[PDB]
PDB file of C-alpha atoms (C1' of nucleotides) in Angstrom:
ATOM      1  CA  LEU A   9     -47.323-107.767 -68.851  1.00  0.00           C
ATOM      2  CA  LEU A  10     -47.897-108.558 -65.130  1.00  0.00           C
ATOM      3  CA  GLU A  11     -47.738-112.180 -66.369  1.00  0.00           C
ATOM      4  CA  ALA A  12     -43.979-112.258 -67.134  1.00  0.00           C
ATOM      5  CA  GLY A  13     -42.579-109.735 -64.602  1.00  0.00           C
ATOM      6  CA  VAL A  14     -42.314-106.839 -67.062  1.00  0.00           C
ATOM      7  CA  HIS A  15     -43.389-104.375 -64.326  1.00  0.00           C
ATOM      8  CA  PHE A  16     -40.387-105.427 -62.124  1.00  0.00           C
ATOM      9  CA  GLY A  17     -37.649-102.873 -62.976  1.00  0.00           C
ATOM     10  CA  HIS A  18     -34.038-102.756 -61.675  1.00  0.00           C
ATOM     11  CA  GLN A  19     -32.551-101.652 -58.291  1.00  0.00           C
ATOM     12  CA  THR A  20     -33.323 -98.159 -56.939  1.00  0.00           C
ATOM     13  CA  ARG A  21     -29.647 -97.255 -56.325  1.00  0.00           C
ATOM     14  CA  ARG A  22     -28.562 -97.778 -59.978  1.00  0.00           C
ATOM     15  CA  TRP A  23     -31.310 -95.974 -61.924  1.00  0.00           C
ATOM     16  CA  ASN A  24     -31.768 -93.298 -64.572  1.00  0.00           C
ATOM     17  CA  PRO A  25     -33.865 -90.400 -63.135  1.00  0.00           C
ATOM     18  CA  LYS A  26     -35.058 -89.645 -66.670  1.00  0.00           C
ATOM     19  CA  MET A  27     -37.181 -92.831 -66.219  1.00  0.00           C
ATOM     20  CA  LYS A  28     -39.629 -91.959 -63.395  1.00  0.00           C
ATOM     21  CA  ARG A  29     -42.312 -90.926 -65.964  1.00  0.00           C
ATOM     22  CA  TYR A  30     -42.537 -94.712 -66.620  1.00  0.00           C
ATOM     23  CA  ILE A  31     -41.951 -95.784 -62.941  1.00  0.00           C
ATOM     24  CA  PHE A  32     -44.814 -96.523 -60.492  1.00  0.00           C
ATOM     25  CA  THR A  33     -43.587 -97.002 -56.882  1.00  0.00           C
ATOM     26  CA  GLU A  34     -40.737 -99.194 -55.505  1.00  0.00           C
ATOM     27  CA  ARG A  35     -40.556-102.452 -53.461  1.00  0.00           C
ATOM     28  CA  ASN A  36     -37.522-104.146 -51.782  1.00  0.00           C
ATOM     29  CA  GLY A  37     -34.906-101.730 -53.169  1.00  0.00           C
ATOM     30  CA  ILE A  38     -36.283-102.274 -56.719  1.00  0.00           C
ATOM     31  CA  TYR A  39     -38.409 -99.897 -58.832  1.00  0.00           C
ATOM     32  CA  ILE A  40     -41.599-101.207 -60.522  1.00  0.00           C
ATOM     33  CA  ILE A  41     -42.725 -99.990 -63.985  1.00  0.00           C
ATOM     34  CA  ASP A  42     -46.332 -98.686 -64.456  1.00  0.00           C
ATOM     35  CA  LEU A  43     -47.756-101.141 -67.000  1.00  0.00           C
ATOM     36  CA  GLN A  44     -50.468 -98.611 -67.952  1.00  0.00           C
ATOM     37  CA  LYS A  45     -47.745 -96.751 -69.930  1.00  0.00           C
ATOM     38  CA  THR A  46     -46.302-100.008 -71.391  1.00  0.00           C
ATOM     39  CA  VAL A  47     -49.836-100.837 -72.595  1.00  0.00           C
ATOM     40  CA  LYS A  48     -49.880 -97.436 -74.423  1.00  0.00           C
ATOM     41  CA  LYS A  49     -46.198 -97.810 -75.466  1.00  0.00           C
ATOM     42  CA  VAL A  50     -46.301-101.368 -76.871  1.00  0.00           C
ATOM     43  CA  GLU A  51     -49.344 -99.939 -78.655  1.00  0.00           C
ATOM     44  CA  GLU A  52     -47.404 -97.114 -80.388  1.00  0.00           C
ATOM     45  CA  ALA A  53     -44.513 -99.503 -81.193  1.00  0.00           C
ATOM     46  CA  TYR A  54     -46.782-102.183 -82.744  1.00  0.00           C
ATOM     47  CA  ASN A  55     -48.189 -99.362 -84.901  1.00  0.00           C
ATOM     48  CA  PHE A  56     -44.710 -97.884 -85.585  1.00  0.00           C
ATOM     49  CA  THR A  57     -43.384-101.285 -86.704  1.00  0.00           C
ATOM     50  CA  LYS A  58     -46.377-102.020 -88.966  1.00  0.00           C
ATOM     51  CA  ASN A  59     -46.242 -98.497 -90.443  1.00  0.00           C
ATOM     52  CA  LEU A  60     -42.532 -99.266 -91.183  1.00  0.00           C
ATOM     53  CA  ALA A  61     -43.039-102.872 -92.414  1.00  0.00           C
ATOM     54  CA  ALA A  62     -45.630-101.927 -95.091  1.00  0.00           C
ATOM     55  CA  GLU A  63     -43.343 -99.120 -96.387  1.00  0.00           C
ATOM     56  CA  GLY A  64     -40.929-101.991 -97.221  1.00  0.00           C
ATOM     57  CA  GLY A  65     -38.682-101.610 -94.156  1.00  0.00           C
ATOM     58  CA  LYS A  66     -36.150-103.972 -92.601  1.00  0.00           C
ATOM     59  CA  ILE A  67     -35.734-104.278 -88.825  1.00  0.00           C
ATOM     60  CA  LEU A  68     -32.579-105.490 -87.091  1.00  0.00           C
ATOM     61  CA  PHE A  69     -33.136-107.184 -83.679  1.00  0.00           C
ATOM     62  CA  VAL A  70     -30.068-106.563 -81.550  1.00  0.00           C
ATOM     63  CA  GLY A  71     -30.049-108.563 -78.334  1.00  0.00           C
ATOM     64  CA  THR A  72     -26.709-110.050 -77.303  1.00  0.00           C
ATOM     65  CA  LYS A  73     -27.599-110.183 -73.572  1.00  0.00           C
ATOM     66  CA  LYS A  74     -27.934-113.782 -72.281  1.00  0.00           C
ATOM     67  CA  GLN A  75     -31.644-113.273 -71.528  1.00  0.00           C
ATOM     68  CA  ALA A  76     -32.464-112.176 -75.139  1.00  0.00           C
ATOM     69  CA  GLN A  77     -30.260-114.285 -77.492  1.00  0.00           C
ATOM     70  CA  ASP A  78     -32.848-116.920 -78.389  1.00  0.00           C
ATOM     71  CA  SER A  79     -35.830-114.516 -78.541  1.00  0.00           C
ATOM     72  CA  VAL A  80     -33.984-112.154 -80.924  1.00  0.00           C
ATOM     73  CA  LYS A  81     -33.009-115.040 -83.243  1.00  0.00           C
ATOM     74  CA  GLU A  82     -36.336-116.930 -83.182  1.00  0.00           C
ATOM     75  CA  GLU A  83     -38.506-113.800 -83.348  1.00  0.00           C
ATOM     76  CA  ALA A  84     -36.457-112.199 -86.183  1.00  0.00           C
ATOM     77  CA  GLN A  85     -36.534-115.463 -88.198  1.00  0.00           C
ATOM     78  CA  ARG A  86     -40.291-115.815 -87.592  1.00  0.00           C
ATOM     79  CA  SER A  87     -40.766-112.309 -89.074  1.00  0.00           C
ATOM     80  CA  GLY A  88     -38.163-112.871 -91.864  1.00  0.00           C
ATOM     81  CA  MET A  89     -35.985-110.090 -90.429  1.00  0.00           C
ATOM     82  CA  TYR A  90     -32.297-109.781 -89.397  1.00  0.00           C
ATOM     83  CA  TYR A  91     -30.576-110.122 -86.005  1.00  0.00           C
ATOM     84  CA  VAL A  92     -27.445-109.982 -83.868  1.00  0.00           C
ATOM     85  CA  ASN A  93     -27.347-112.263 -80.821  1.00  0.00           C
ATOM     86  CA  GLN A  94     -23.611-112.914 -80.351  1.00  0.00           C
ATOM     87  CA  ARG A  95     -21.666-109.685 -80.673  1.00  0.00           C
ATOM     88  CA  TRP A  96     -22.551-106.438 -82.409  1.00  0.00           C
ATOM     89  CA  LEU A  97     -19.563-105.796 -84.704  1.00  0.00           C
ATOM     90  CA  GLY A  98     -18.277-102.190 -84.373  1.00  0.00           C
ATOM     91  CA  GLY A  99     -19.250-100.843 -87.755  1.00  0.00           C
ATOM     92  CA  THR A 100     -22.125-103.195 -88.584  1.00  0.00           C
ATOM     93  CA  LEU A 101     -23.940-100.136 -90.107  1.00  0.00           C
ATOM     94  CA  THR A 102     -21.427 -97.250 -90.101  1.00  0.00           C
ATOM     95  CA  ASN A 103     -18.847 -99.513 -91.762  1.00  0.00           C
ATOM     96  CA  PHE A 104     -21.542-101.574 -93.571  1.00  0.00           C
ATOM     97  CA  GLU A 105     -19.534-101.792 -96.836  1.00  0.00           C
ATOM     98  CA  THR A 106     -16.731-103.577 -94.963  1.00  0.00           C
ATOM     99  CA  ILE A 107     -19.250-105.869 -93.214  1.00  0.00           C
ATOM    100  CA  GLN A 108     -20.631-106.391 -96.756  1.00  0.00           C
ATOM    101  CA  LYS A 109     -17.232-107.940 -97.639  1.00  0.00           C
ATOM    102  CA  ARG A 110     -17.753-110.603 -94.968  1.00  0.00           C
ATOM    103  CA  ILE A 111     -21.444-111.048 -95.821  1.00  0.00           C
ATOM    104  CA  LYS A 112     -19.859-111.992 -99.159  1.00  0.00           C
ATOM    105  CA  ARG A 113     -16.772-114.074 -98.164  1.00  0.00           C
ATOM    106  CA  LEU A 114     -19.050-116.249 -95.945  1.00  0.00           C
ATOM    107  CA  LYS A 115     -21.512-116.968 -98.768  1.00  0.00           C
ATOM    108  CA  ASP A 116     -18.501-117.698-101.057  1.00  0.00           C
ATOM    109  CA  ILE A 117     -16.889-120.127 -98.539  1.00  0.00           C
ATOM    110  CA  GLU A 118     -20.404-121.691 -98.407  1.00  0.00           C
ATOM    111  CA  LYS A 119     -20.381-121.933-102.241  1.00  0.00           C
ATOM    112  CA  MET A 120     -16.941-123.667-102.100  1.00  0.00           C
ATOM    113  CA  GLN A 121     -18.613-126.336 -99.893  1.00  0.00           C
ATOM    114  CA  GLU A 122     -21.466-126.681-102.485  1.00  0.00           C
ATOM    115  CA  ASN A 123     -19.790-126.581-105.985  1.00  0.00           C
ATOM    116  CA  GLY A 124     -16.987-128.866-104.728  1.00  0.00           C
ATOM    117  CA  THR A 125     -13.691-127.043-104.055  1.00  0.00           C
ATOM    118  CA  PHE A 126     -13.208-128.693-100.601  1.00  0.00           C
ATOM    119  CA  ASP A 127     -11.839-131.953-102.092  1.00  0.00           C
ATOM    120  CA  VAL A 128      -9.509-130.121-104.552  1.00  0.00           C
ATOM    121  CA  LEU A 129      -6.995-128.241-102.339  1.00  0.00           C
ATOM    122  CA  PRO A 130      -7.366-129.965 -98.932  1.00  0.00           C
ATOM    123  CA  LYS A 131      -4.940-130.291 -95.948  1.00  0.00           C
ATOM    124  CA  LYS A 132      -4.387-126.908 -94.156  1.00  0.00           C
ATOM    125  CA  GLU A 133      -6.487-124.965 -96.629  1.00  0.00           C
ATOM    126  CA  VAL A 134      -9.947-126.567 -96.174  1.00  0.00           C
ATOM    127  CA  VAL A 135      -9.662-126.798 -92.368  1.00  0.00           C
ATOM    128  CA  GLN A 136      -8.753-123.074 -92.532  1.00  0.00           C
ATOM    129  CA  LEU A 137     -11.790-122.193 -94.708  1.00  0.00           C
ATOM    130  CA  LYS A 138     -14.278-124.224 -92.634  1.00  0.00           C
ATOM    131  CA  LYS A 139     -13.019-122.635 -89.365  1.00  0.00           C
ATOM    132  CA  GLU A 140     -13.447-119.271 -91.183  1.00  0.00           C
ATOM    133  CA  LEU A 141     -16.924-120.200 -92.399  1.00  0.00           C
ATOM    134  CA  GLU A 142     -17.734-120.856 -88.708  1.00  0.00           C
ATOM    135  CA  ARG A 143     -16.299-117.529 -87.362  1.00  0.00           C
ATOM    136  CA  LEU A 144     -18.567-115.865 -89.976  1.00  0.00           C
ATOM    137  CA  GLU A 145     -21.450-118.288 -89.126  1.00  0.00           C
ATOM    138  CA  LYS A 146     -21.159-117.168 -85.493  1.00  0.00           C
ATOM    139  CA  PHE A 147     -20.842-113.408 -85.859  1.00  0.00           C
ATOM    140  CA  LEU A 148     -22.570-112.400 -89.124  1.00  0.00           C
ATOM    141  CA  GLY A 149     -25.053-115.296 -88.907  1.00  0.00           C
ATOM    142  CA  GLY A 150     -28.265-113.192 -88.853  1.00  0.00           C
ATOM    143  CA  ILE A 151     -27.375-110.158 -91.012  1.00  0.00           C
ATOM    144  CA  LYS A 152     -26.194-112.842 -93.501  1.00  0.00           C
ATOM    145  CA  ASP A 153     -28.971-111.652 -95.911  1.00  0.00           C
ATOM    146  CA  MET A 154     -29.121-107.911 -94.946  1.00  0.00           C
ATOM    147  CA  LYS A 155     -28.619-106.089 -98.281  1.00  0.00           C
ATOM    148  CA  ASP A 156     -29.298-102.385 -97.527  1.00  0.00           C
ATOM    149  CA  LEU A 157     -29.087-100.588 -94.185  1.00  0.00           C
ATOM    150  CA  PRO A 158     -31.780-101.642 -91.630  1.00  0.00           C
ATOM    151  CA  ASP A 159     -34.525 -99.031 -91.451  1.00  0.00           C
ATOM    152  CA  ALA A 160     -35.126 -99.430 -87.714  1.00  0.00           C
ATOM    153  CA  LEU A 161     -33.444-101.274 -84.830  1.00  0.00           C
ATOM    154  CA  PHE A 162     -35.023-103.374 -82.099  1.00  0.00           C
ATOM    155  CA  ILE A 163     -32.474-103.161 -79.263  1.00  0.00           C
ATOM    156  CA  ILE A 164     -32.742-104.985 -75.899  1.00  0.00           C
ATOM    157  CA  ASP A 165     -31.047-103.469 -72.835  1.00  0.00           C
ATOM    158  CA  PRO A 166     -29.765-100.340 -74.679  1.00  0.00           C
ATOM    159  CA  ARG A 167     -27.054-100.079 -71.976  1.00  0.00           C
ATOM    160  CA  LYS A 168     -25.370-103.314 -73.102  1.00  0.00           C
ATOM    161  CA  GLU A 169     -25.971-102.192 -76.729  1.00  0.00           C
ATOM    162  CA  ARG A 170     -24.392 -98.708 -76.270  1.00  0.00           C
ATOM    163  CA  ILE A 171     -22.361 -99.433 -79.440  1.00  0.00           C
ATOM    164  CA  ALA A 172     -25.380-100.523 -81.493  1.00  0.00           C
ATOM    165  CA  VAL A 173     -27.321 -97.487 -80.316  1.00  0.00           C
ATOM    166  CA  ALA A 174     -24.597 -95.017 -81.307  1.00  0.00           C
ATOM    167  CA  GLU A 175     -24.298 -96.500 -84.818  1.00  0.00           C
ATOM    168  CA  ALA A 176     -28.060 -96.123 -85.285  1.00  0.00           C
ATOM    169  CA  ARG A 177     -28.082 -92.609 -83.898  1.00  0.00           C
ATOM    170  CA  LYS A 178     -25.174 -91.658 -86.168  1.00  0.00           C
ATOM    171  CA  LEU A 179     -27.094 -92.728 -89.268  1.00  0.00           C
ATOM    172  CA  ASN A 180     -30.455 -91.212 -88.059  1.00  0.00           C
ATOM    173  CA  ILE A 181     -32.141 -94.639 -88.101  1.00  0.00           C
ATOM    174  CA  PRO A 182     -34.801 -95.047 -85.325  1.00  0.00           C
ATOM    175  CA  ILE A 183     -34.420 -97.451 -82.373  1.00  0.00           C
ATOM    176  CA  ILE A 184     -37.326 -99.316 -80.807  1.00  0.00           C
ATOM    177  CA  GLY A 185     -35.729-100.312 -77.511  1.00  0.00           C
ATOM    178  CA  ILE A 186     -36.915-102.322 -74.531  1.00  0.00           C
ATOM    179  CA  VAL A 187     -35.662 -99.807 -71.929  1.00  0.00           C
ATOM    180  CA  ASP A 188     -35.336-100.648 -68.202  1.00  0.00           C
ATOM    181  CA  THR A 189     -35.270 -98.196 -65.250  1.00  0.00           C
ATOM    182  CA  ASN A 190     -31.476 -97.829 -65.800  1.00  0.00           C
ATOM    183  CA  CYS A 191     -31.714 -96.643 -69.426  1.00  0.00           C
ATOM    184  CA  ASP A 192     -31.516 -93.175 -70.996  1.00  0.00           C
ATOM    185  CA  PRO A 193     -34.918 -93.055 -72.822  1.00  0.00           C
ATOM    186  CA  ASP A 194     -33.929 -90.130 -75.135  1.00  0.00           C
ATOM    187  CA  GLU A 195     -31.530 -92.189 -77.303  1.00  0.00           C
ATOM    188  CA  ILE A 196     -34.365 -94.623 -78.062  1.00  0.00           C
ATOM    189  CA  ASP A 197     -37.019 -93.283 -80.500  1.00  0.00           C
ATOM    190  CA  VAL A 198     -39.754 -95.780 -79.540  1.00  0.00           C
ATOM    191  CA  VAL A 199     -39.348 -96.517 -75.805  1.00  0.00           C
ATOM    192  CA  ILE A 200     -40.906 -99.716 -74.385  1.00  0.00           C
ATOM    193  CA  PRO A 201     -40.706 -99.475 -70.543  1.00  0.00           C
ATOM    194  CA  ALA A 202     -40.115-103.025 -69.375  1.00  0.00           C
ATOM    195  CA  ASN A 203     -37.823-105.440 -67.564  1.00  0.00           C
ATOM    196  CA  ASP A 204     -35.190-106.686 -70.030  1.00  0.00           C
ATOM    197  CA  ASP A 205     -33.410-108.816 -67.356  1.00  0.00           C
ATOM    198  CA  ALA A 206     -36.049-111.632 -67.416  1.00  0.00           C
ATOM    199  CA  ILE A 207     -36.332-114.162 -70.278  1.00  0.00           C
ATOM    200  CA  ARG A 208     -40.154-114.386 -70.206  1.00  0.00           C
ATOM    201  CA  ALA A 209     -40.356-110.562 -70.269  1.00  0.00           C
ATOM    202  CA  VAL A 210     -38.204-110.056 -73.398  1.00  0.00           C
ATOM    203  CA  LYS A 211     -39.733-113.102 -75.107  1.00  0.00           C
ATOM    204  CA  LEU A 212     -43.199-111.517 -74.852  1.00  0.00           C
ATOM    205  CA  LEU A 213     -42.260-108.007 -75.995  1.00  0.00           C
ATOM    206  CA  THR A 214     -40.033-109.311 -78.838  1.00  0.00           C
ATOM    207  CA  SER A 215     -42.940-111.465 -80.070  1.00  0.00           C
ATOM    208  CA  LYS A 216     -45.268-108.456 -80.581  1.00  0.00           C
ATOM    209  CA  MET A 217     -42.815-106.620 -82.868  1.00  0.00           C
ATOM    210  CA  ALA A 218     -42.474-109.687 -85.087  1.00  0.00           C
ATOM    211  CA  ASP A 219     -46.306-109.992 -84.912  1.00  0.00           C
ATOM    212  CA  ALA A 220     -46.667-106.505 -86.483  1.00  0.00           C
ATOM    213  CA  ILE A 221     -44.302-107.541 -89.278  1.00  0.00           C
ATOM    214  CA  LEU A 222     -46.405-110.672 -89.891  1.00  0.00           C
ATOM    215  CA  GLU A 223     -49.688-108.675 -89.556  1.00  0.00           C
ATOM    216  CA  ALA A 224     -48.589-106.403 -92.479  1.00  0.00           C
ATOM    217  CA  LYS A 225     -47.370-109.544 -94.322  1.00  0.00           C
ATOM    218  CA  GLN A 226     -51.085-110.559 -94.179  1.00  0.00           C
TER     219      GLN A 226
ATOM    220  C1'   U B   1      37.754 -90.966-107.921  1.00  0.00           C
ATOM    221  C1'   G B   2      34.498 -94.963-110.214  1.00  0.00           C
ATOM    222  C1'   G B   3      34.423 -99.923-109.258  1.00  0.00           C
ATOM    223  C1'   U B   4      35.652-103.938-105.844  1.00  0.00           C
ATOM    224  C1'   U B   5      37.007-105.518-101.240  1.00  0.00           C
ATOM    225  C1'   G B   6      37.340-106.258 -96.149  1.00  0.00           C
ATOM    226  C1'   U B   7      34.133-104.797 -91.604  1.00  0.00           C
ATOM    227  C1'   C B   8      27.793-103.866 -86.781  1.00  0.00           C
ATOM    228  C1'   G B   9      24.242-108.676 -91.543  1.00  0.00           C
ATOM    229  C1'   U B  10      18.970-111.079 -88.031  1.00  0.00           C
ATOM    230  C1'   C B  11      19.552-109.669 -84.165  1.00  0.00           C
ATOM    231  C1'   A B  12      14.322-106.581 -83.171  1.00  0.00           C
ATOM    232  C1'   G B  13       8.330-106.050 -86.025  1.00  0.00           C
ATOM    233  C1'   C B  14       6.481-102.056 -88.811  1.00  0.00           C
ATOM    234  C1'   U B  15       1.962-100.119 -91.475  1.00  0.00           C
ATOM    235  C1'   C B  16      -2.690 -99.391 -94.523  1.00  0.00           C
ATOM    236  C1'   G B  17      -8.169 -99.106 -96.080  1.00  0.00           C
ATOM    237  C1'   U B  18     -12.797 -98.196 -94.071  1.00  0.00           C
ATOM    238  C1'   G B  19     -15.110 -97.209 -89.300  1.00  0.00           C
ATOM    239  C1'   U B  20     -14.960 -95.174 -84.607  1.00  0.00           C
ATOM    240  C1'   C B  21     -13.038 -91.861 -80.424  1.00  0.00           C
ATOM    241  C1'   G B  22     -10.458 -86.869 -79.741  1.00  0.00           C
ATOM    242  C1'   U B  23     -11.097 -79.297 -80.867  1.00  0.00           C
ATOM    243  C1'   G B  24      -6.211 -81.224 -81.894  1.00  0.00           C
ATOM    244  C1'   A B  25      -1.384 -83.568 -81.924  1.00  0.00           C
ATOM    245  C1'   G B  26      -3.179 -88.313 -81.573  1.00  0.00           C
ATOM    246  C1'   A B  27      -5.726 -93.310 -80.303  1.00  0.00           C
ATOM    247  C1'   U B  28      -8.000 -97.780 -81.613  1.00  0.00           C
ATOM    248  C1'   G B  29      -7.171-101.754 -84.941  1.00  0.00           C
ATOM    249  C1'   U B  30      -1.740-103.476 -83.075  1.00  0.00           C
ATOM    250  C1'   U B  31      -3.282-102.155 -74.544  1.00  0.00           C
ATOM    251  C1'   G B  32      -6.715-107.613 -73.138  1.00  0.00           C
ATOM    252  C1'   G B  33      -6.432-113.516 -71.463  1.00  0.00           C
ATOM    253  C1'   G B  34      -3.853-117.575 -72.865  1.00  0.00           C
ATOM    254  C1'   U B  35      -0.275-120.025 -76.181  1.00  0.00           C
ATOM    255  C1'   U B  36       4.191-120.535 -79.571  1.00  0.00           C
ATOM    256  C1'   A B  37      10.895-121.297 -81.412  1.00  0.00           C
ATOM    257  C1'   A B  38       8.395-116.988 -83.235  1.00  0.00           C
ATOM    258  C1'   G B  39       7.431-110.630 -85.695  1.00  0.00           C
ATOM    259  C1'   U B  40       3.027-117.698 -83.486  1.00  0.00           C
ATOM    260  C1'   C B  41      -2.011-119.025 -83.162  1.00  0.00           C
ATOM    261  C1'   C B  42      -6.778-118.872 -80.705  1.00  0.00           C
ATOM    262  C1'   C B  43     -10.137-116.253 -77.779  1.00  0.00           C
ATOM    263  C1'   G B  44     -11.452-111.826 -76.728  1.00  0.00           C
ATOM    264  C1'   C B  45     -12.666-106.388 -77.918  1.00  0.00           C
ATOM    265  C1'   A B  46     -15.016 -99.939 -81.588  1.00  0.00           C
ATOM    266  C1'   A B  47     -13.486-102.184 -84.612  1.00  0.00           C
ATOM    267  C1'   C B  48     -13.915-104.892 -89.303  1.00  0.00           C
ATOM    268  C1'   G B  49     -10.358-106.591 -92.949  1.00  0.00           C
ATOM    269  C1'   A B  50      -5.595-106.305 -95.319  1.00  0.00           C
ATOM    270  C1'   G B  51      -0.267-105.300 -96.605  1.00  0.00           C
ATOM    271  C1'   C B  52       5.014-105.485 -95.781  1.00  0.00           C
ATOM    272  C1'   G B  53       8.659-108.016 -93.213  1.00  0.00           C
ATOM    273  C1'   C B  54       9.208-113.399 -91.527  1.00  0.00           C
ATOM    274  C1'   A B  55       8.657-117.637 -94.200  1.00  0.00           C
ATOM    275  C1'   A B  56       8.282-118.866 -99.193  1.00  0.00           C
ATOM    276  C1'   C B  57       9.854-118.169-104.066  1.00  0.00           C
ATOM    277  C1'   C B  58      15.408-120.767-106.783  1.00  0.00           C
ATOM    278  C1'   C B  59      19.032-125.126-106.178  1.00  0.00           C
ATOM    279  C1'   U B  60      20.229-129.967-103.578  1.00  0.00           C
ATOM    280  C1'   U B  61      18.655-134.478-100.759  1.00  0.00           C
ATOM    281  C1'   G B  62      15.148-138.439 -98.251  1.00  0.00           C
ATOM    282  C1'   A B  63       9.853-141.809-100.175  1.00  0.00           C
ATOM    283  C1'   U B  64       6.775-142.757-104.313  1.00  0.00           C
ATOM    284  C1'   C B  65       4.366-142.675-109.072  1.00  0.00           C
ATOM    285  C1'   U B  66       3.937-141.665-114.420  1.00  0.00           C
ATOM    286  C1'   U B  67       6.566-140.913-119.066  1.00  0.00           C
ATOM    287  C1'   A B  68      11.437-142.549-121.346  1.00  0.00           C
ATOM    288  C1'   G B  69      14.454-147.370-122.014  1.00  0.00           C
ATOM    289  C1'   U B  70      19.914-146.367-124.636  1.00  0.00           C
ATOM    290  C1'   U B  71      25.365-146.002-125.049  1.00  0.00           C
ATOM    291  C1'   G B  72      22.438-147.585-118.659  1.00  0.00           C
ATOM    292  C1'   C B  73      19.866-152.514-116.206  1.00  0.00           C
ATOM    293  C1'   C B  74      20.056-158.825-116.376  1.00  0.00           C
ATOM    294  C1'   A B  75      15.515-160.734-112.251  1.00  0.00           C
ATOM    295  C1'   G B  76      13.826-164.713-115.077  1.00  0.00           C
ATOM    296  C1'   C B  77      15.840-167.658-120.369  1.00  0.00           C
ATOM    297  C1'   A B  78      20.781-168.907-124.434  1.00  0.00           C
ATOM    298  C1'   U B  79      26.023-167.766-123.893  1.00  0.00           C
ATOM    299  C1'   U B  80      30.555-166.741-120.485  1.00  0.00           C
ATOM    300  C1'   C B  81      36.892-164.273-119.763  1.00  0.00           C
ATOM    301  C1'   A B  82      32.953-161.099-119.247  1.00  0.00           C
TER     302        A B  82
END
RNA sequence: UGGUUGUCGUCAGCUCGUGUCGUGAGAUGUUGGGUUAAGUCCCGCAACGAGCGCAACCCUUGAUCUUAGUUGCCAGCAUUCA
């Protein structure tokens, strides 16, 4: 935790005052997070995840900030989960049935590549379908398998993910968020007080969630 | 009066499903940054996708191939006014 710079929160000027129950002192116009709480928070979350994984849950890892794109992919894949690391599509869950059309289409344009319909009707048509396979292999690349609604989210910087958070909260699905000092901690069900704006920081905290999925898999 | 004629005939962009925002009328999608002859296309983006119109569909022509060689063709052979 001290290792990565988790403790190091954001600037003092642009903070959420609902956060100071996880803040421990400032330095150089920047709040610092009390890791003692994070210890006891990462705890509850590890438990929460593993209590959800063994039920038969699915977790979506939503981190489209530059610092958390690789982590979210790699860590979701490691724990055979889902993820969004490019853009959360307005209505991923609230309009899931429409996103289920594209989760189809994509797989079907992938089947056209397999069976052999890309040397039948070529010219404009196959260029079109490949460039459409790629739009769907950018945006729906991680929820590609997601069959039923995710049963919890793992959001990173829930201020960038305002739109993810509000879909989750609409459908009464919990949200395990890595919250900074500039984040409303009431939206998030399982808060994890940490820096989200460092790559090492995220990469550590993301790992432990996927660890709890793999610990119930064993 | 029917019907048929002249005469404002391309000239402009319109919408939907689901989702979301709004008490609501509404909004978004379809305001953004480029780009195109364009009602174009790509990137965006709380939207994700689609429809209509446009264009196409029908007819004609430019290249080629396959099938069909007769009453059409004669290159290469016999004839010859042909």
